[PDB]
mmCIF file of C-alpha atoms in Angstrom:
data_model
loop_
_atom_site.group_PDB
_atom_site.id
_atom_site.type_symbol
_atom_site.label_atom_id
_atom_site.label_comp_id
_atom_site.label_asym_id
_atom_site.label_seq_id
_atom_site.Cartn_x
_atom_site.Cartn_y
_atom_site.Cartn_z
ATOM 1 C CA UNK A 1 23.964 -42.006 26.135
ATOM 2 C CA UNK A 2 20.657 -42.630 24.145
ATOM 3 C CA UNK A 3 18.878 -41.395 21.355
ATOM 4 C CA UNK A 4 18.542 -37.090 20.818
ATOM 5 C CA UNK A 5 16.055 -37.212 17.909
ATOM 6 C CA UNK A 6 12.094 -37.838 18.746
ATOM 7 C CA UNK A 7 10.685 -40.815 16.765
ATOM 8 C CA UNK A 8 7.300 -42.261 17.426
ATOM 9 C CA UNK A 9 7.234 -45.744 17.023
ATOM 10 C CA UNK A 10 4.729 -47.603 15.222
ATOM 11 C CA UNK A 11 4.754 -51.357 16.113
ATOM 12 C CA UNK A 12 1.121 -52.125 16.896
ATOM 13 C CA UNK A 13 -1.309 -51.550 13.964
ATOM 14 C CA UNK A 14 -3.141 -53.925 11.695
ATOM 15 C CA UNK A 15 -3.011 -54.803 7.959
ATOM 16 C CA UNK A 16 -6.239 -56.295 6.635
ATOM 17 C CA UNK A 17 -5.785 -57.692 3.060
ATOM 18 C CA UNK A 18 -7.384 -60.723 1.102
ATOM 19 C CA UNK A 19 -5.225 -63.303 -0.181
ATOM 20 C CA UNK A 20 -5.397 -61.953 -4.290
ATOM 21 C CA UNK A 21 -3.422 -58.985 -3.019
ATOM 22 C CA UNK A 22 -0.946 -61.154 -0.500
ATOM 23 C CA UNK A 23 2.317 -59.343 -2.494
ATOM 24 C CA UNK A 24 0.845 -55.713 -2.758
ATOM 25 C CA UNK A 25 0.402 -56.034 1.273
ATOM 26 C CA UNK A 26 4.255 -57.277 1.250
ATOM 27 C CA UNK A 27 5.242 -54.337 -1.219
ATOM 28 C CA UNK A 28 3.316 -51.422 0.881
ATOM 29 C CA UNK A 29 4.801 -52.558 4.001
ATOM 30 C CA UNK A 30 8.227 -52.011 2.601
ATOM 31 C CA UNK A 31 7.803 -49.357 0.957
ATOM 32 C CA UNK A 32 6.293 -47.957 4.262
ATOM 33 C CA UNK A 33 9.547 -48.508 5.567
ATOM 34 C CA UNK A 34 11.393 -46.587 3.135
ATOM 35 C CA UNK A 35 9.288 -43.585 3.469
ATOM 36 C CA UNK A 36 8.802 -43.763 6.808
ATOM 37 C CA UNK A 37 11.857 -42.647 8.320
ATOM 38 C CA UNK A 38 11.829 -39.429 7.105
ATOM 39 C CA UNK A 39 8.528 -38.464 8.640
ATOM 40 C CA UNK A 40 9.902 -39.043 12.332
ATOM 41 C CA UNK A 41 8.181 -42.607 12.381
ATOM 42 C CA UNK A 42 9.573 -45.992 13.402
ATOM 43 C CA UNK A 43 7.640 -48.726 11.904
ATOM 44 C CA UNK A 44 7.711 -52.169 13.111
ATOM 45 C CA UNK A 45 5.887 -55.005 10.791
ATOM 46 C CA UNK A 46 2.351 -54.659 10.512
ATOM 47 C CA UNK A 47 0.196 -57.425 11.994
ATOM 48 C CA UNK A 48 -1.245 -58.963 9.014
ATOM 49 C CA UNK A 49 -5.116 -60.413 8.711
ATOM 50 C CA UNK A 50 -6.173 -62.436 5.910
ATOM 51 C CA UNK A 51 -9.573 -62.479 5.043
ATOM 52 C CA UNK A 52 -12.225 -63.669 2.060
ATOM 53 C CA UNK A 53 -12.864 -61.060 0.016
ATOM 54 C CA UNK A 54 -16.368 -60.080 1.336
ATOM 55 C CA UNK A 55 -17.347 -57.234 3.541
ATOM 56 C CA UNK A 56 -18.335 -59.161 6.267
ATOM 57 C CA UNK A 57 -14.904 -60.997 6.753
ATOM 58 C CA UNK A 58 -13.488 -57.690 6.649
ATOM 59 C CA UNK A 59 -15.431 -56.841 9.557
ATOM 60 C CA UNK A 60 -15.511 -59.568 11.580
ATOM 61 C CA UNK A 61 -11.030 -59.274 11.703
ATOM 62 C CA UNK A 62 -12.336 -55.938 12.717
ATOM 63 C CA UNK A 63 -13.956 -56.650 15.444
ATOM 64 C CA UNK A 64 -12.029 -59.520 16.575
ATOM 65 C CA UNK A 65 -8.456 -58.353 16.215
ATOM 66 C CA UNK A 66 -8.927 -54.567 17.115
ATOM 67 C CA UNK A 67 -7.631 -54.010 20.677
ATOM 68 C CA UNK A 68 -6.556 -50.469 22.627
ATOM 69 C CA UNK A 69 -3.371 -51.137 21.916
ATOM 70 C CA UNK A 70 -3.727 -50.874 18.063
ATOM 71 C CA UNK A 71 -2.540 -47.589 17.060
ATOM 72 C CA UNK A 72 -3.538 -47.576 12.891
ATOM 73 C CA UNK A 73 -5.283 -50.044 10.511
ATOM 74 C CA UNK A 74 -5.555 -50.390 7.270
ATOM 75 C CA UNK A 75 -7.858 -51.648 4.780
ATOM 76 C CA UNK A 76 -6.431 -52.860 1.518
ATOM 77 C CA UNK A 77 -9.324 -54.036 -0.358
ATOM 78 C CA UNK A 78 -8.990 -55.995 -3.868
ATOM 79 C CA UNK A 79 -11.010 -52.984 -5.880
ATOM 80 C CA UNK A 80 -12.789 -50.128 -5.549
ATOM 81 C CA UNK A 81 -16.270 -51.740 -5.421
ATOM 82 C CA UNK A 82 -18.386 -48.871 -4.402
ATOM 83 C CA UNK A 83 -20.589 -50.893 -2.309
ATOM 84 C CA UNK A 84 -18.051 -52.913 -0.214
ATOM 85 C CA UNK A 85 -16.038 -49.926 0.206
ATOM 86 C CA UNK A 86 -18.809 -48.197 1.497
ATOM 87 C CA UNK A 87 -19.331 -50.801 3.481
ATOM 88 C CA UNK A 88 -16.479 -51.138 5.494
ATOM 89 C CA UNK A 89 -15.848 -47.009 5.380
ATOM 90 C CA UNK A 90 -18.731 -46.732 7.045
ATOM 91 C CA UNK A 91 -18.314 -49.520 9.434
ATOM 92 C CA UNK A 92 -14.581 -48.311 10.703
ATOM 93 C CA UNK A 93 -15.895 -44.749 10.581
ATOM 94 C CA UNK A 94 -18.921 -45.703 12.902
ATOM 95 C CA UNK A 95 -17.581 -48.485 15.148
ATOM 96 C CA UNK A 96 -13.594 -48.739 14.949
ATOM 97 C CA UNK A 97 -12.619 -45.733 17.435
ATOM 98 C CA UNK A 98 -8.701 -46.848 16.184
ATOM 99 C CA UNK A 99 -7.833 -44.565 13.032
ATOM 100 C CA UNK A 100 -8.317 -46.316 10.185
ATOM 101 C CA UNK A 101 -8.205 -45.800 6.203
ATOM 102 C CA UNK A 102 -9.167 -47.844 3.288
ATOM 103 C CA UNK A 103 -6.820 -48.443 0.105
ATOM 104 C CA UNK A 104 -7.464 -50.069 -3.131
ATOM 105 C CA UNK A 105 -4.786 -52.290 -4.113
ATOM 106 C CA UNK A 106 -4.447 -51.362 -7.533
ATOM 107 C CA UNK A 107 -3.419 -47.763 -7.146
ATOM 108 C CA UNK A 108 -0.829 -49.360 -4.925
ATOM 109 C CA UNK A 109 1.979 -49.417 -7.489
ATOM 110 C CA UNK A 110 2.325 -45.438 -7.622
ATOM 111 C CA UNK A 111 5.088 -43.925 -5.335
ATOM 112 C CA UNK A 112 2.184 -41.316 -4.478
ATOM 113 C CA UNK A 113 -0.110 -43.555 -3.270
ATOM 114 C CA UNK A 114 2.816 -44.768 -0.785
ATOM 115 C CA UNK A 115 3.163 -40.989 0.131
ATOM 116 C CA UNK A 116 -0.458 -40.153 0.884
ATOM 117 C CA UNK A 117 -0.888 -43.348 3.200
ATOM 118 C CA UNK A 118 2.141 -42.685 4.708
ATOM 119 C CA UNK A 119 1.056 -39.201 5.180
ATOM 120 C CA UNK A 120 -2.059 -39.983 6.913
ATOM 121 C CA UNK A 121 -0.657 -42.670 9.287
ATOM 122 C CA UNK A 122 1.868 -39.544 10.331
ATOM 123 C CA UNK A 123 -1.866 -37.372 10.816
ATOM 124 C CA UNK A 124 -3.203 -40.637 12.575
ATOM 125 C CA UNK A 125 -0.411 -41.027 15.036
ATOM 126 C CA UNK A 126 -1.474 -37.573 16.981
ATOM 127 C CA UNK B 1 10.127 -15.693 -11.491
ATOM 128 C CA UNK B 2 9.707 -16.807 -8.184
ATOM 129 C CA UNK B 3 12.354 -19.700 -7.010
ATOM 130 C CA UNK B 4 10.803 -20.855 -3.528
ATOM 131 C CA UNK B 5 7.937 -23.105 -4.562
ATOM 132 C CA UNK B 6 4.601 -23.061 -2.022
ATOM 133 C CA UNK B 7 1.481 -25.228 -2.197
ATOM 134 C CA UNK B 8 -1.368 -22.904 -2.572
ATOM 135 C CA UNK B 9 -4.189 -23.597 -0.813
ATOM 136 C CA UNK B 10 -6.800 -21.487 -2.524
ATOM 137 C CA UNK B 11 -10.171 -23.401 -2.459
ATOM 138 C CA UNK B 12 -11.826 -24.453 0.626
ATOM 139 C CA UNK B 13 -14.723 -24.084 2.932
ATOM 140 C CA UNK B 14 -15.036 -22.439 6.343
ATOM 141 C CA UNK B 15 -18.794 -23.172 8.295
ATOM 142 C CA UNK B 16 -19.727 -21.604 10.738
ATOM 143 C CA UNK B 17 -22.647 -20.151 12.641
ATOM 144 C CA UNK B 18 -23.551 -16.202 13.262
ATOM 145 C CA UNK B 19 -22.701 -16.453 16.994
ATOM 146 C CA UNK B 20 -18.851 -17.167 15.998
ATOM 147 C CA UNK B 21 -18.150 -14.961 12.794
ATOM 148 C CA UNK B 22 -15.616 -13.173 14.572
ATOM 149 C CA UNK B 23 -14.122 -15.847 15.824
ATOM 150 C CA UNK B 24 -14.071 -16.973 11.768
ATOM 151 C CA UNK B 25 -12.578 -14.601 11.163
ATOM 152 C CA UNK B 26 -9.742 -14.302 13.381
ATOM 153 C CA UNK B 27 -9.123 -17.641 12.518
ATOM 154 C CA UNK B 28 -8.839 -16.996 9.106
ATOM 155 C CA UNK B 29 -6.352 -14.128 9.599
ATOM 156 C CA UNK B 30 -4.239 -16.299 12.805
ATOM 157 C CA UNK B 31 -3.646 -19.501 9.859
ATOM 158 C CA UNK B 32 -2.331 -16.831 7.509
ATOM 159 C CA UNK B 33 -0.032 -16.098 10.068
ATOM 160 C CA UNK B 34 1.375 -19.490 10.876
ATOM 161 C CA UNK B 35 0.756 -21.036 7.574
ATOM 162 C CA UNK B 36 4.183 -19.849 5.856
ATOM 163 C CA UNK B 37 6.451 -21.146 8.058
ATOM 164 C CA UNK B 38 4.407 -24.753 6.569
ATOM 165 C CA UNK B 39 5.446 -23.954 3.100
ATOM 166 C CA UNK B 40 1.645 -22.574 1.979
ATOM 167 C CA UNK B 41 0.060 -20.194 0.756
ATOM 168 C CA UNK B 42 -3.318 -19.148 1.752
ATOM 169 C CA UNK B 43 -6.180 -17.869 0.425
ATOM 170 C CA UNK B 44 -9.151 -16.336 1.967
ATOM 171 C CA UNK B 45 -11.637 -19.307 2.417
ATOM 172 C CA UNK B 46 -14.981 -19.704 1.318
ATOM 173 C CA UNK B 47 -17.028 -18.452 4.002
ATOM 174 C CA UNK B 48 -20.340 -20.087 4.726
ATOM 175 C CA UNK B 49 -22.858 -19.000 7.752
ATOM 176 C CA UNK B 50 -25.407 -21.530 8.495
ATOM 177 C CA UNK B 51 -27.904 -21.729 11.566
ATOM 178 C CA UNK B 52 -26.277 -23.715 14.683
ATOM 179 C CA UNK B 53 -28.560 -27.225 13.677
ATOM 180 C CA UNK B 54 -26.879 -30.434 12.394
ATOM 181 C CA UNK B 55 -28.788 -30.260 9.604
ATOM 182 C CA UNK B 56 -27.727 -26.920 8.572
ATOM 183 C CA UNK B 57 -23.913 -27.861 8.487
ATOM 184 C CA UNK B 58 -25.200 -30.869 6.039
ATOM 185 C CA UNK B 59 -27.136 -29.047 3.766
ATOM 186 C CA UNK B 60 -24.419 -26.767 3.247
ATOM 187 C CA UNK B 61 -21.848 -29.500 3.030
ATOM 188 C CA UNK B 62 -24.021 -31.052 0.199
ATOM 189 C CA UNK B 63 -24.092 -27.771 -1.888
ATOM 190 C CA UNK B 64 -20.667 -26.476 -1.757
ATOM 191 C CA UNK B 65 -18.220 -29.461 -1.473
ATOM 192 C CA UNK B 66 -16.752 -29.487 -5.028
ATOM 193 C CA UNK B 67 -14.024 -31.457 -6.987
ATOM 194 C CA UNK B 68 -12.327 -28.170 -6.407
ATOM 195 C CA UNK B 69 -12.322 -28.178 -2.372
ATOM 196 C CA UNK B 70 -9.082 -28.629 -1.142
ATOM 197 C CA UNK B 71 -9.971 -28.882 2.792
ATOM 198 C CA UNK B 72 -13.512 -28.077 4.517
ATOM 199 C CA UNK B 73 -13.334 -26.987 8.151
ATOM 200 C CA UNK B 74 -16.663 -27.156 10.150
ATOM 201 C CA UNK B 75 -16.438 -24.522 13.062
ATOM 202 C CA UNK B 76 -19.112 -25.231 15.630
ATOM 203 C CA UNK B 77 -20.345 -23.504 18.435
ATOM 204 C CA UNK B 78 -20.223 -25.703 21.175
ATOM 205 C CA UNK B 79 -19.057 -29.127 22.185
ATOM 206 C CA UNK B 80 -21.862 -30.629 22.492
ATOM 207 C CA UNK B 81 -21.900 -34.215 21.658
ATOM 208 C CA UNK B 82 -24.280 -34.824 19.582
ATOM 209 C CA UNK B 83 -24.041 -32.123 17.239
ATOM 210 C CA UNK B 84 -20.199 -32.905 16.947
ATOM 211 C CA UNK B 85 -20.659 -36.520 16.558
ATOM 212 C CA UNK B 86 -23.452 -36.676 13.980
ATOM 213 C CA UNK B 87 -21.157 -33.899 11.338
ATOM 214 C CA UNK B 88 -18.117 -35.863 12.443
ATOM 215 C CA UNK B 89 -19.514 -39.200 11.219
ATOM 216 C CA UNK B 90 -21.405 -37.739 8.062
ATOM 217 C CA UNK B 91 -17.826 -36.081 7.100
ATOM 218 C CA UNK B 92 -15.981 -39.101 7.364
ATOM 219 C CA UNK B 93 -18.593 -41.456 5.890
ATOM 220 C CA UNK B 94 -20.227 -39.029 3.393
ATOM 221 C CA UNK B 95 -17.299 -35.967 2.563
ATOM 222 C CA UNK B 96 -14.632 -37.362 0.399
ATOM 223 C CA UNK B 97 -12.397 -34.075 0.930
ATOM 224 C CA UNK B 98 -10.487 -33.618 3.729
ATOM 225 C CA UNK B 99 -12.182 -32.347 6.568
ATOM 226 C CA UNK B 100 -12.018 -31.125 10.289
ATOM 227 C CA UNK B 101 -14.288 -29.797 13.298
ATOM 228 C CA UNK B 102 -13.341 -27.100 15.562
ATOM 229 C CA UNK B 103 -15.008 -26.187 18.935
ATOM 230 C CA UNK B 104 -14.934 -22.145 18.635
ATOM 231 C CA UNK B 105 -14.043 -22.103 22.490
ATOM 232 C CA UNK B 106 -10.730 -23.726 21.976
ATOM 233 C CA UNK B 107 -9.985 -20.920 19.269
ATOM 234 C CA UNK B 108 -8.555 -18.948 22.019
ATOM 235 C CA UNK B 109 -5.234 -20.572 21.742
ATOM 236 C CA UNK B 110 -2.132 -20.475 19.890
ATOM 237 C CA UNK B 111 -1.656 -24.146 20.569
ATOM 238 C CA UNK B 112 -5.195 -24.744 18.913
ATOM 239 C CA UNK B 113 -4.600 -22.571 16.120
ATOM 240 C CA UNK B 114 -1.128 -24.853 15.021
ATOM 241 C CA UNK B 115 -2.712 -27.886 15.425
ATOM 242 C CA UNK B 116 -5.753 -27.119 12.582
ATOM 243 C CA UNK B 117 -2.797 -25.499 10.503
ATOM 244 C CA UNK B 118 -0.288 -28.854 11.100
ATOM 245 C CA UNK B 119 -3.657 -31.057 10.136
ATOM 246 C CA UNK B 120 -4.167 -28.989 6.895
ATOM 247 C CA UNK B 121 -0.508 -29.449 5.818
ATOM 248 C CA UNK B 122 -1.100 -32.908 6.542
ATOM 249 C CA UNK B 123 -4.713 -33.051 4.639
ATOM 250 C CA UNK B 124 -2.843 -31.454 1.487
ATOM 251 C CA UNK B 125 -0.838 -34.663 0.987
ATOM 252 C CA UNK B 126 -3.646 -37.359 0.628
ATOM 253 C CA UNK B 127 -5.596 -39.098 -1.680
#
């Protein structure tokens, strides 16, 4: 036979991170993959870009890595520094037609956090 | 005292323009229909006529979006383009609640009126 229960699969998407953070990108991915499941999604690895922690590397992996087949991206950024986040929020929200969301590493170690990103990937992926 | 818990949804924003108050309306009483089976429960929502110019949804969106706004659903009356795209881009860069646009035309669906409810179910989970 084969498979009775929908899935979507999620094996394309991108994981934008600076190098600070390298083990809270590791950490969300696998948590992603415990709560994922459950939600009707199966997650492949995420393709992981490391950048300097300025806006503008942000944005150029943005422009240089985001392709049609990219289904979610994420932006985990090393604080909540109003003005890069801004930055880049306004950037994806302007010129990244891919679903995107920013998260700031540091709320990261709450099971909640994991939920609500989780939760909008599932939003994302329709 | 009640066993089942629900996730009330209570406090949030409906705009729309004078043209499409009924159509407000009905959508307001078709997502207390459908909105049970999701596990919440709905309050009436803050209703807020504005006239049909970009500028007008803004405005209001600058008054009325609180701490307290759980979701904030712009209702507009047409597709066109540029209207859509400039409160699209000024929700998701400027609104830090959870937001969506409808095209009243599309209203006239079942199919459209699960989809808004599914994305508020979703919107209730996120930070």
């Amino acid at each position: 036979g084969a498979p009775l229960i929908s899935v979507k699969p999620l094996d394309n998407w991108l994981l934008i991170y600076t190098r600070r953070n390298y083990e809270a990108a590791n950490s969300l991915i696998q948590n992603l993959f415990k709560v994922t499941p459950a939600m009707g999604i199966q997650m492949k690895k995420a393709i992981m870009i490391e950048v300097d922690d300025r806006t503008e590397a942000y944005l150029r992996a943005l422009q240089q890595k985001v392709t049609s087949d990219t289904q979610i991206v994420v932006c985990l950024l090393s604080s909540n520094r109003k003005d890069k986040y801004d930055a880049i929020k306004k950037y994806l929200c302007t010129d990244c037609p891919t679903p995107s969301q920013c998260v700031v590493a540091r709320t990261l170690g709450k099971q909640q956090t994991v939920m609500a990103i989780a939760t909008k990937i599932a939003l994302q992926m329709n």
